[model samples]
Target: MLIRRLKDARLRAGISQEKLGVLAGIDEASASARMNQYEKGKHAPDFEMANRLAKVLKIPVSYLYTPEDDLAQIILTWNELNEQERKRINFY
Candidate 1:
C-alpha cells in the first residue's frame, strides 16, 4: 500500500519527494529524497511520519495501509477533484 499509494499521491499532486516531507512539517524531514526510498520499500516510514504524510495528503493513515487497494485508490482519485466534480460523482 505504501509503495503504490505514496507514489500515486505524490505524483498526482505533483509534489516532489523532498517537498512532501516539508509539507508534513516535521523537523527532521530530510532535504534529500528519503521519500523516494520509502516509496521504493527501501525503508518503511515511522507511524508518526505516516500520520503526518496522511494529514498533509488529506487522507487517513489507515488509507495508506488499507488492504483493499482498489478502495484506497478510488478514494485517492476521488480527492483529486474539486467539490463540484466530487459532489456530482457521488450522485452515482
Candidate 2:
C-alpha cells in the first residue's frame, strides 16, 4: 500500500531516507530511523506529513493511497514523461 508507494516515490525522486524525513518536516534526529520504519511498513505518516512528503517529491498526494500497485506505479511514471512521450501512448 502506501508504505511501498512512499518508498518507491522517494527512491524515484533520488532522495535519501534521511533527507526525506527532514523534507517532510520530521525531526532531524529521528528522521532517518523514522523513515526506515515507514519504508518497512512498521509505521505510517499522518496526513499532514504525507502531504509534505508528496509536495517535496513533486507527486500527487493520491499516489500514496492507490490500492492497485501497478496502476499507482504507472501513474507515477506517467507523470514523469514528457508531453510528446505521453502522446505516443494509447491508454485505450
Candidate 3:
C-alpha cells in the first residue's frame, strides 16, 4: 500500500524512475531494479531508504505509513501563507 502510493505520487509529480531514485540518494544502477521490485510490492525498503524517499518527496515521515482512509490533517493552516505568517510562527 505505501509503496503503491509512493510510485503513484512520483508519477503524478512527473518524476522519472531514475531521477526519483537519485533524488532519494539511491544508486541509480542498483536501485533502478530494486525500486521496481519495491513499487511492485515484491520487496520493501529499509528505514533509512524510506526516510530518504520521504525527504526527497517533501512529505512528512509519518505520511509514509499513513493509510488513505485515516489521514492526518495539517496542523498549521496559516503556515501555508506569506512571510508574515512564517515570522509569526517563528516568533511564538
Candidate 4:
C-alpha cells in the first residue's frame, strides 16, 4: 500500500529516490539505497519518517498509508485542486 503510493508521489514530484530520502532527513550516505529499499517494498519508513516525507512532499500523511488506490491517488495531488476541482471528483 504505502510502497506503491510512496514511489508514485516521489516520481510525480519529479524527485529522485535519493533526493526524497535526503529531504526526508534520512542519512545522506544511506539515503539513496535506503529509498530504493523502501520503494522496492524491502523496507518501510517508520511513523516519524513518513511524516517527514509528507511534509517534504507537501501531501497529507494519510496518502502514504492508505490501501485504497483511488483515494491514495487523489490525496497525492490533493493540494493541486481548487474547491471546485475537488468537488468534481466523485468518491461514490
What is candidate 3's TM-score against the reference?
0.68
Q: Model 2, 1-92: lDDT tens per residue?
A: 37878877898889899999898888999999998998898888788888888998898788998989788878778878898888877553
* Clash number by candidate, in order: 0, 0, 0, 0
Q: List the candidates ranked by lDDT, beginning with the highest.
A: 2, 4, 1, 3
Query: Which scores better on lDDT, 2 or 4?
Result: 2
Specify the poorest-scoring 10-residue window by lDDT in model 2: 83-92
List per-candidate RMSD values in Å. Answer: 3.8, 3.1, 4.2, 3.2
| Top-lDDT structure, candidate number | 2
Off by over 4 Å in 2: 77-92
Q: Which regions of candidate 4 are displaced past 4 Å? A: 81-92
lDDT of 2 at 23: 87
Which tens-of-lDDT digit does each residue in 1-92 have in candidate 3? 37756776677557776677888887868767777777777888887888787677666555656566335234223424578877876798
Off by over 4 Å in 3: 70-92
- What lDDT does candidate 4 reach at residue 21? 90
Over the full model, what C-alpha lDDT does candidate 2 score relative to the true structure?
0.85
